[PDB]
């Protein structure tokens, strides 16, 4: 289950890829609204003429156009407002010559297959005031044909050129949420995308060497039509805040905690309270799942926007936390130690040979309690054995597995979810879950053990009796050999052996944190292992 953390870090690069496009871009009840809509829209034309005698036009281009109308839907006269715009246009040009006399078109816009037509749509119906929290949204529409019409050019001399022809089919491709800016309020609207397909009518300009040109110029794209109409259906699923099964809001304009809080302050208490209802054996079963990104983030009942960015938002927050910086510092220290036989003096070794895993550092030191040097050394080492946990250099199930299992079983139960809450609750959970955790390394039927709390223990596997802890041997063992998380750490092991005489195989498995022995002991309702796992779960307190 710890794999999720690793994967987030591993995938953190994609987060950057998101930000780029983003900065290029700019309980609950499900209620359904399938509505048969009729989008009536149109284009506008900007015809800016150049100086001189009027033979030259500086620009003849598209311009967004607004439209209002009323139509019948299930016997309801519904007033609708739409705004049509275009994107990705081809800037053709005509250059009759350098003289002021010759027909010149500096830049005229034609929409082709590489363009897109965007249409905001709104109405005063119920469906369009329930779409603040949206689960799913999908619209189908019959394609429409937009043909270009005639447009004569105002030359006072000679034949009048005419812009005839031109046609494109708009086919529905995608619908999203959008906003209409009024004078004093802001309206939620449905913005439909339409892909263009060139059609047989080819637009040409008379008095010119222009023919068999395809697209839809901006000159007279309406072709005299009052509007362009597409009839279809849009399906919307809205998440309405409801705390009882008999009520259902007509409108969902309700405020949620994240509309007012950006730093979750009291949701920490919600999580700490949720911790009570956690089962033990089933938690182990969940912790043994290789929880990947899909498994972790598939079961959350999100909104339309939240699901679209859950993984990358979580990862954006993830590649900043103390865990990510600790991983980065460990990697840099290892690379520096490997990169130069120059500063073995700067680093001081608590082992036979120098290693980044076995270096002593700042440790401002705590005179509050009489502290042995060995305790400080072991604590400093264990704080990096945590990065060993998150570097696939462990053997048994690790504390990170338990942390991930608790995180999953809590986020699914927690009713507090939002595009900003899941970030900083996954990351801060990984940071603050099980802060005091111990590790052990086995060698020649002897177990060495260290803890971030500063407690160290050396003992024998066959019989759990403590041994003079041999620093400079625990360090050499721990730099290379597999490191085992101490789920059933020495004290619990000795208590269990004294009270519940365990077999050689059971002790073997418990030492290496084998899941099977753990779950079998839990199923027997053994108070000691249950107590230890309860302490571990309550340590996952965020």
């Amino acid at each position: 289950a710890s794999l999720i953390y690793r994967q987030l870090l591993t995938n953190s690069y994609t987060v950057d890829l998101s930000d780029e496009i983003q900065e290029i871009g700019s309980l609950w009840k499900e209620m359904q609204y399938n509505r048969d809509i009729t989008i009536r829209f149109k284009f506008a034309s900007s015809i800016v003429k150049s100086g001189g005698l009027g033979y030259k036009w500086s620009e003849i281009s598209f311009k967004p156009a607004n439209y209002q109308y009323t139509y019948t839907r299930d016997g309801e006269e519904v007033t609708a407002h739409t705004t049509c715009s275009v994107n990705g246009m081809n800037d053709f040009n005509f250059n009759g010559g350098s003289l002021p006399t010759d027909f010149v078109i500096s830049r005229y816009e034609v929409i082709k297959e590489n363009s897109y037509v965007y249409v905001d749509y709104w109405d005063d119906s119920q469906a369009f005031r329930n779409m603040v929290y949206v689960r799913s949204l999908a619209a189908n529409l019959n394609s429409v044909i937009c043909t270009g019409g005639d447009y004569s050019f105002a030359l006072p001399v000679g034949q009048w050129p005419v812009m005839t022809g031109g046609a494109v089919s708009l086919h529905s491709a995608g619908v999203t949420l959008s906003t209409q800016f009024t004078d004093f309020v802001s309206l939620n609207s449905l913005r439909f995308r339409f892909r263009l397909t060139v059609e047989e009518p080819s637009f040409s300009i008379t008095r010119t060497r222009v023919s068999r040109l395809y697209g839809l110029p901006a000159a007279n794209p309406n072709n005299g039509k009052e509007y362009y109409e597409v009839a279809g259906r849009f399906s919307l699923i809205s998440l309405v805040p409801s705390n009882d099964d008999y009520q259902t809001p007509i409108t969902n304009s309700v405020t949620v905690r994240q509309d007012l809080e950006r730093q979750l302050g009291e949701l920490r208490e919600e999580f700490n309270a949720l911790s009570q209802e956690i089962a033990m054996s089933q938690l182990i079963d969940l912790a043994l799942l290789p929880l990947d990104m899909f498994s972790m983030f598939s079961g959350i009942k999100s909104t339309i926007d939240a699901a679209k960015s859950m993984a990358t938002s979580v990862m954006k927050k993830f590649k900043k936390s103390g865990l990510a910086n600790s991983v980065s510092t460990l990697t840099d220290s290892l690379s520096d130690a490997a990169s130069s036989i120059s500063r073995g003096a700067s680093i001081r070794s608590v082992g036979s040979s120098a290693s980044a895993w076995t270096d002593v550092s700042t440790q401002i030191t705590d005179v509050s309690s009489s502290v042995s040097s060995i305790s400080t050394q072991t604590s400093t080492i264990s704080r990096r054995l945590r990065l060993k946990e998150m570097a696939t250099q462990t053997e048994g199930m690790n504390f990170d597995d338990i942390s991930a299992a608790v995180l999953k079983t809590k986020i699914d139960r927690s009713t507090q979810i939002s595009p900003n809450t899941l970030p900083d609750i996954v990351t801060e959970a990984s940071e603050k879950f099980i802060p005091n955790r111990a590790y052990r390394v086995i060698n020649n039927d002897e177990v060495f053990e260290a803890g971030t709390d500063g407690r160290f223990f050396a003992y024998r596997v066959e019989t759990f009796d403590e041994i003079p802890f041999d620093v400079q041997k625990f360090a050499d063992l721990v730099t290379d050999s597999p490191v085992i998380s101490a789920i059933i750490d020495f004290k619990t092991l000795k208590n269990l052996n004294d009270n519940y005489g365990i077999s050689r195989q059971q002790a073997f498995n418990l030492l290496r944190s084998d899941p099977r022995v753990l779950r079998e002991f839990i199923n027997q309702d053994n108070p000691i292992i249950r107590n230890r796992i309860e302490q571990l779960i309550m340590q996952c307190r965020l």
Binding site: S143, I145, S169, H171, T197
Partner: protein
């Protein structure tokens, strides 16, 4: 549906023909010209008494009249436990009569087709589009992945391919796996997406005159004549009804109880 283990040594049970004749109803469907040529207001009672001689209790035989094959094809409601449709043969209507047979000699699971908003396709050989009404003029425009049409423009119905005109019933079969845009006169027609499940065993069709032309399967490689498709030559309708009455046991033998559990809304004439 459970496994049914039986012994090959079991003894044949007595004839159930009398019991089924007593506890079931028979429906006879005939064209209006039959009653015209017969020219007798009591012919229903005469046939009822003849059937009673054959065994059917009085009232179990129901006689239903239809103007012609085209009119009968508009939602043919078959009531009785056993249905026999006397279908006059017309060389000009070979498809239409066939379609009618295909509609009533098979079980169809149908759902509505809201064409004006949705794009439809046929998934397998059992899938067809059954359209019924006063005038069903269906035009089809095959499409592609880019949603464009093949030899047709979705925005210009005039370019849609004509597959039916002024039809009371038509079974449309198009290429499977291809989306089509459909333009049919919804005012005087209703088109349903249907799957044929299997034979409808309680409906037999007796073609009065002509030759074996029925093709109840769209597959060109099969033109099967099941035991429920009879064909009799004729010159008088009284002889037709006499031969139907006399061989009623044979006709019912060729038929079996419907056995299907339906969800539609149709009245029945049962005992």
């Amino acid at each position: 549906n459970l496994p049914i283990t039986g012994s090959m040594d079991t003894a044949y049970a007595n004839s159930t023909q009398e019991e089924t004749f007593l506890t079931s109803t028979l429906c006879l469907y005939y064209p209006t010209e039959a009653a015209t040529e017969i020219n007798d207001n009591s012919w229903k009672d005469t046939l009822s008494q003849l059937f009673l001689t054959k065994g059917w209790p009085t009232g179990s035989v129901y006689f239903k009249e239809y103007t012609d094959i085209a009119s009968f094809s508009v939602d043919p409601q078959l009531y009785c436990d056993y249905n026999v449709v006397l279908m006059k043969y017309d060389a000009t209507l070979q498809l239409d009569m066939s379609e009618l047979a295909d509609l009533i000699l098979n079980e169809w699971l149908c759902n509505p087709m809201d064409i004006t908003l949705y794009y439809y396709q046929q998934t397998d050989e059992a899938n067809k589009w059954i359209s019924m009404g006063s005038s069903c003029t269906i035009k089809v425009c095959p499409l592609n992945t880019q949603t464009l049409g093949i030899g047709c423009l979705t925005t210009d119905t005039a370019t849609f391919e004509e597959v039916a005109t002024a039809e009371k019933l038509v079974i449309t079969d198009v290429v499977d796996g291809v989306n089509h845009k459909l333009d049919v006169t919804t005012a005087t027609c209703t088109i349903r997406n249907c799957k044929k499940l299997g034979p409808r065993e309680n409906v037999a069709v007796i073609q009065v005159g002509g030759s074996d032309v029925l093709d109840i399967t769209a597959d060109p490689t099969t033109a099967p004549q099941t035991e429920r498709m009879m064909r009799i030559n004729w010159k008088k309708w009284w002889q037709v009804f006499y031969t139907v009455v006399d061989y009623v046991n044979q006709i019912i033998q060729a038929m079996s109880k419907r056995s299907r559990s339906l969800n539609s809304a149709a009245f029945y004439y049962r005992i």
